[PDB]
Amino acid sequence: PIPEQIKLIVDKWNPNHPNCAFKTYLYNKVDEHTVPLYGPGPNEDPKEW
Amino acid sequence: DEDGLISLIFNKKESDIRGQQQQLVESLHKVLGGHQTLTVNVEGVKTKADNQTEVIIYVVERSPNGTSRRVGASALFSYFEQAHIKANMQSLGVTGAMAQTELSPVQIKQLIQNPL
């Protein structure tokens, strides 16, 4: 179980988002009717969104 | 969007911008390709800080039939943000740019889905 923890730690400290462990969301204000836009991108879990 | 206004921030003092405005406008014309069908116009110049100046421009394009109109702001911004063009702009002292058009949600969604 050694080369798993290592890979998981290498995964934690990373912007690739494999359970980044630095996952916090900040709410940016946007007036309507632009709400329909945004619209995440590459590695966004709809769950988190 | 039809008003075609792009705001540019320059890392230059206002007096320097105004003092060489002819040259600045022609350099922007060159960045656009320099053809006689495009004309850069200055809408306004405003000091923002000791060595920061905002210059608002638009570009008039002429058609083969002699008709003229402003380049849409989104279209002009899209050109200026292209990596090669942005670099040329930075060489003129531009450190930022903004369009006034408030994009629709569908436009924003498209930009996020295809950031390049």
Add this chain to the structure above:
Amino acid sequence: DEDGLISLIFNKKESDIRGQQQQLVESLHKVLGGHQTLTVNVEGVKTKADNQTEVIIYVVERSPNGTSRRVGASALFSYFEQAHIKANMQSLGVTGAMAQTELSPVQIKQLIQNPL
């Protein structure tokens, strides 16, 4: 209303509708403007008489941010009842249409005050 269902009556036999469903769906997509942000879906097909078939559809619209949702039934019905669109629909064999949303009294009052 969020389910976006529009019932269409066609003056065609059920076997003919099903036999050319790909073509029928694309023609409806064309009536809507044909953009890739709209997709016509068939919810059901039911015979009503020898040469009458009901086809229930909805339309999925995609936003610039990749999000999708159904076009509201009232909005879709409003489009299809516009005189130019209705005529195009009639050319496909459509002889009637219905939305399932039960309008509020205030909505009904508005439609009567402004029938166009």
